Design a protein around this ligand. Structure first.
Ligand SMILES: Nc1ncnc2c1ncn2[C@@H]1O[C@H](COP(=O)(O)OP(=O)(O)OP(O)(O)=S)[C@@H](O)[C@H]1O
Ligand SMILES: Nc1ncnc2c1ncn2[C@@H]1O[C@H](COP(=O)(O)OP(=O)(O)OP(O)(O)=S)[C@@H](O)[C@H]1O
Ligand SMILES: Nc1ncnc2c1ncn2[C@@H]1O[C@H](COP(=O)(O)OP(=O)(O)OP(O)(O)=S)[C@@H](O)[C@H]1O
Lengths: 487, 484, 487, 62
């Protein structure tokens, strides 16, 4: 009771389960990659190329397959981009492992070489990585450009990448990490894609509570009140209005409802107010302007008020919304991501998400590597010669580890249309002795080109995390010989 | 009615059932051993290498298999480490037994030799065991290091083993046993593993009026409610706690708002609605009695802690009941990144505390890595030579079964289990080494005493006696009656 | 309607049913005998070697098999030990019977010889039985030693047998039967087996109610109160305590609760008291010391108080318990049977049960016979020569009765490992002419030895009851030719 | 073991001795074979396999 496989029947059951889900996302990789449509129990339709979003929301029930969905889940959590690459490598590491298992090379000699090779792969990637001075904006634009590319060449326009770099370099808390939560993302409509602007303000989908109040305010000290400013019919709000005036706040964002009596008194003072702003927008206003959300009107302080640079009720795209925005030295930045349809906007929103990560990782690390399966060949040849200096049966585990690294450049040709056998030799011979280190496959051109001059560059964290997450997972999976599954 | 197997069909049914569960945990043994994932009815997932935790929580229904889950259950209860080794030996003793049963050698002649060999095995392990002075801290560090190793080489760091020895040598009540309950285990978060420094109740104080940290506190554990109305009916209840002389009060039920003022008026600190699991922890750690009546609360029913403090550790404000100085009680703040890591680092110390505590109580250690298994095997085969009768073959099969552990160590290492089994066997003859064993990382046969691979004598002596007595009883069954 | 077997199909149906349950308990016999595990409908597990406990609690449904579970049931009721032997003999008497039935020798000629042989077997056992008169303690120790042996050689220790004889010889109501109910059995834990003590006494699992009270008293008068000595806060117990002092009882056993006020006053007088003693222990204290159970304090008498020799709160085996010991002439004796685990204690409790029976039977009867299948050979050869002096077809029934007696010494070799065909000749030839009468098989030695010098002896009632109970049952079963089973 | 013992320079004459077990120098052991044993065996096997890899249709009568 109830389900058990013995030795050889258990090892092959776990390896096959990891490989079968790897082939599901193997076509998606590359600029010439494919998309997947997922229809669940509800009949809800969603089409995505992103490898991590496929594995999470589809029906998977095999115990061994569920353990491999933790690799991509920790890939999107740590890096973001390279979720597809982290899964495919893990599948090839299982394919090269079972070839050794059939020859009676023991799993612990395999795990001995696999760990030692991954330990050397991390210290070899550091030497081949290029340094991009944290504020080297011309390279940071290329890194951002490489991130937008892959999701679409038409999405990759010169002006878009220049906007993203300016936002990330500003939110750096010296010295000197990058917080991704400091950048606010707004999804609004209107004929755009090109009208996407780099913004200084939360965009609140609301108006002014009274038409008597000013349409625009200068240098607004913003009081974020969570508490209700409410009443009857006997001016019981003149205290509540004066308490806000005591702090010196000319703009008031209220999360709850503002009563009609208070609307007149706040308009008489000259204070602009808004009733029932979304809880999501209130948390944005607190971090962007530097404000504190206060849940009591009697204790509202002047040092709990935020500072904005432009507050205006513009009738943009027809809808009259409150522009907060605009800042001399902003530690928080808002991105007004706009497009024709909401489904386009959400895609342009997720495209920036990857572009923010890579530039943020470059500032924190220093470090980029050549993409398009370029550094995968350099690391592969450097670990095979590293295997030569290893005596024993653990050498063959390092050899299988290095031969598994050539799967990414091989799959990039599989989805491109070109032969995966011919190019795999062309790039391999173009890495020997000295040059290039930066030689890779360009899927549009066809011939092997220098990736440094093309503008195809990825952060070092995209490659270092993907290898370590796949190695640690495959090492654990090769340590299972008995499976106990109840029910 | 309802199920019965006859003679040969009953003996083979019981032997096969014991062997089939032995192979389930046979791959887990060794530094390069395998792990097991168990998915039960609820869909709850847990991965473990520990042999005893697998057999307890998995679905086992065969009558003969359930009897062998009492060997490892009494292995973790008596020793702790060596739960895997105790099961594998019992499986090999059944394999070597049925080889004799098919040759028409009577089971009582088998049980005659098996007991006589186990009686000799216990009086042969005593010589090959090395004496470890109770406060020889350089060897005690090695014993602790050998305990952490096996669960992970990355877990085995030089600084960790030095911390453990200092705690165990301090809690020794002269003279001169070691109480494992004196060491308090705390599970907290924070970027640690290395920040691990030499009861934690998830609650606060019932009133902000009450103070925060005493020295030499007396703790009254009350199960009964301290409750009321609006006419100071708690002034008796508060004074009855003051009558005993307890400045700290842990209440399992609810404390009423009127009593909160009066307890804080005296200076007594109270906590309302502490979990039943935590109340049983506080009673055994401090030495307290759980009292279910406020009228009979005595001063000798109170526990004694060293340091009680409401620290805001990891954000959460919790009651730190530990502590001391020149200390008969020690607290271990076991910390790590995720809670699942912390619990594993907590269980790794559990084995490390046991071995050092056993070394102080006994004196005694034996070489690990399948080293003393070969020495005992060759000494019992020559012991079999001086036995006349058919009971000799039972002693020979008993001694040949002892070479299973060194054989399985090579099975999971990668090296040949047939080649090394000869190399070590030849390196034990005449005199040297007695301490010769297999090092899975090096590959070649090395001296285990110089490598630092040492285990307490109780790990080997208990495992043999628990496996021998179980297999002796299992070979005494010829008819099985299973109703329903 | 509904079930019936005709003649030959009915006789063979009943004989086979008696033999199949006999083989179930056939392997349990002997010092190297096997144990049986019984799993019922509830899933309750219990392992036992004792033959009578197996047959009672296991699922048996055949009509002929249920009638044979009355032999062992009346064996444990009359004797105690020899429940296994009584069943195996009955099975062999059915095997030797159907060999005669297939040869067309009529059942009434079979029952004619079977009764006549059993009538002679009883008068031949009396001549071969050895006399050890009722208080011959050196032989009584051997009889007790022989009873403990069979359940375990490690259980058979010199000191244990000496303790049992002293208890049985004391509870004899002159003149001069032995009541087995007079010996109280207590099952308590602690590192023992050797710490098992003879109590003319009760061992109460409790302490003193107040630490102010004395710890050891000589010639103590014990008042057994069943009523509660209780109160408020106005010394309403000074009457109750003085009423205890009015009788003259320095020791006080209370079944209910003693109030805290009374605890001080009883300690002031010097009277030792205990609160909430188990009802089982209170009935023990009343019969051992010679006390009365007392419920309503107001009437306390000196002639209801029991008399003990030594009352001491010893911290034996860690636990501090009240040692009520040292009676002078006890007609009732308590045995504090102790061991490590409760499952060990229960086995050491049942081992004494057989040891009490045999010594009690020796005092009531006078006799012992040699065990280990020794007297079974002597009676077998003496009945074959008795068969020679019988003319007719009833002779073959006596011959089959005598040939069936050699099953016990044969089965003793079966479970020993030695050949059951070779030894069966060795002992048979060693009984001819004169010697030995006390020659039998020692399973540990292997060779045939004199059982009288070895110390292997069993009471005559163990053999005489087992033969008569098996003979009368088999005689009735051979008288059935039609079976009517409804439903 | 032998593959790593051929790198850079030495040995060229390193091989496996089946009786000893460990890798030994074959020149000092006395294990030597003529060049024609190796040169003929390669050329005879290469020319045969080259011809066999040139067949895509098989006609077998009877
Ligand atoms: N123009 C290009 N020419 C060649 N390779 C490219 C080009 N643009 C991107 N790549 C490479 O294609 C890979 C990215 O392919 P994708 O299909 O986006 O998968 P992924 O980035 O691994 O995972 P996602 O994006 O999270 S789904 C990286 O290895 C890039 O270096
Ligand atoms: N470095 C080492 N070299 C060789 N043998 C070792 C080494 N460290 C430990 N051992 C041996 O490995 C065995 C311990 O293996 P484990 O897999 O931990 O199983 P166990 O201790 O029998 O049971 P657990 O720990 O309770 S699961 C002992 O027989 C040790 O003596
Ligand atoms: N040391 C011994 N050597 C030879 N025979 C022995 C020895 N001890 C006991 N016996 C015999 O073994 C038989 C007792 O075996 P047991 O298995 O205890 O069965 P039983 O007494 O018939 O039934 P139980 O005890 O009620 S289950 C008797 O016939 C004894 O005379």
């Amino acid at each position: 009771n109830m389900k058990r496989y013995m030795g050889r029947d258990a090892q092959r059951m776990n390896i096959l389960a990891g490989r079968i889900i790897a082939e599901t996302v193997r076509s998606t990789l590359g600029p010439k990659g494919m998309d997947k449509m997922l229809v669940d129990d509800l009949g809800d339709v969603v089409v995505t190329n992103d490898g991590v979003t496929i594995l999470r929301e589809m029906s998977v029930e095999h115990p061994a397959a569920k353990m491999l969905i933790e690799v991509a889940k920790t890939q999107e959590k740590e890096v973001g981009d390279g979720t597809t690459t982290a899964v495919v490598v893990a599948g090839e590491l299982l394919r090269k492992a079972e070839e050794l298992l059939d020859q009676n090379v023991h799993p612990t000699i395999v795990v001995k070489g696999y760990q030692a090779a991954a330990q050397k792969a991390q210290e070899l990637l550091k030497t081949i990585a290029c340094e991009v001075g944290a504020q080297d904006k011309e390279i940071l634009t290329k890194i951002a450009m490489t991130s937008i590319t892959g999701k679409g060449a038409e999405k990759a326009k010169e002006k878009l990448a220049e906007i993203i770099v300016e936002a990330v370099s500003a939110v750096v808390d010296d010295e000197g990490k990058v917080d991704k939560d400091l950048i606010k993302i707004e999804k609004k409509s209107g004929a755009s894609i090109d009208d996407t602007e780099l913004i200084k303000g939360v965009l609140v989908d609301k108006e002014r509570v009274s038409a008597q109040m000013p349409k625009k305010v200068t240098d607004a000290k913003i009081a974020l009140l969570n508490c209700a400013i409410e009443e009857t019919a006997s001016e019981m709000l003149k205290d509540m209005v004066a308490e806000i005036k005591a702090s010196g706040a000319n703009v008031l964002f209220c999360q709850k409802g503002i009563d009609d009596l208070a609307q007149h008194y706040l308009a008489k003072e000259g204070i602009v107010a808004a009733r029932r702003v979304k809880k999501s927008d209130m948390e944005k206003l607190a971090k962007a302007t530097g404000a504190n959300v206060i849940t009591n009107i009697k204790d509202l302080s002047a040092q709990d008020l935020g500072d904005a640079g432009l507050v205006e009720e513009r009738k943009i795209s027809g809808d009259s919304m409150i522009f907060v925005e605009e800042c001399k030295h902003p530690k928080a930045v808002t991105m007004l991501i706009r497009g024709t349809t909401e489904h386009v906007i959400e895609e342009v929103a997720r495209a920036v998400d990857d572009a923010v990560g890579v530039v943020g990782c470059t500032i924190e690390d220093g470090r980029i590597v050549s993409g398009g399966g370029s550094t995968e060949v350099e690391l592969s040849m450097k670990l095979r010669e590293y295997a030569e200096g290893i005596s024993g049966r653990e050498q063959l585990a390092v050899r299988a580890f290095a031969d598994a690294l050539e799967v990414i450049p091989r799959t990039l040709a599989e989805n491109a249309g070109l032969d995966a056998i011919e190019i795999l030799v062309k790039v391999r011979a173009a890495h020997a002795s000295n040059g290039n280190k930066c030689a890779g496959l360009n899927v549009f051109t066809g011939a092997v080109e220098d990736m440094c001059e093309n503008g195809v560059v990825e952060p070092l964290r995209v490659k270092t995390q993907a290898i370590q997450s796949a190695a640690e997972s495959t090492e654990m999976l090769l340590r299972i010989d008995d499976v106990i599954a109840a029910e």
